[PDB]
Subunit: 57 residues, 6 copies
């Protein structure tokens, strides 16, 4: 299983590594899939690259 | 935050509902963002649409 | 420019055709890019495949 | 509704802000969906990262 | 490496198996990366879900 | 056809140009599609943005 996670930039390396672990575990638990088979890639977005309702976040 | 989860098909409806909640939950925790801001979309793949070594799965 | 639009299923052929038209125009106009260079792909999601906050 | 938009780098913030807004409205009108439910994320690509026909764009 | 390939529907299983192999080999060869580390996932699009210039392809 | 290729950062422009071409050739070859219709976009990921099993690379 492969997860692409789109988040706004500004988080620390530690916060994002925690994100990777917990999401991977969340994926593994929900599916009864081996944790080792879980892949996560993070994509960050600058504020001028993210919209909610036609307006920037 | 937006999470795209790519999985092989064949798993049950409830697992995918659990997947959505817990991934949503894990992201909210890791980033301390409101759950309402978290969106999860699942894409399933038939065996002929997935490769790992140039070979199907 | 490439736009991938993720939507919940249930929309009409006309709405999704209109979506392609209007999004393409918006991209071309906003960026001053040639319309012919704009590609849009639509992906539908059954409700059980799309989630908000749980 | 979620729109991921891939564009070549080199545009100004104002153009990309117009892009997010104008695209979001277009999605809202076309689908009869609430504007606030429309999400747009922009990804920029350097010239060496985009190909059209095996050749860089 | 992860490759998402978006194509119009209508191809045979065998063509798409070839797609997975040939692309995976190309990724492995171009990058000098182990073939086993290369993942390919295919997404198909009906003609009404794909546009080239605001018009269906 | 549209190919998004996710790779770890650190490669030179020349290798990634080779990646784009060979992947483009493989796609055209596999599907019997005109090369000019093949689009490839590369997205790079820093080491802290990629996880395999809850852990970084």
């Amino acid at each position: 299983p492969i997860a692409q996670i789109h988040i706004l930039e500004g988080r620390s390396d530690e916060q994002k590594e925690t994100l990777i672990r917990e999401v991977s575990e969340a994926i593994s638990r929900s599916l009864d899939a081996p944790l080792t088979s879980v892949r996560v890639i993070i994509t960050e977005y600058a504020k001028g690259h993210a919209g909610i309702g036609g307006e920037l976040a």
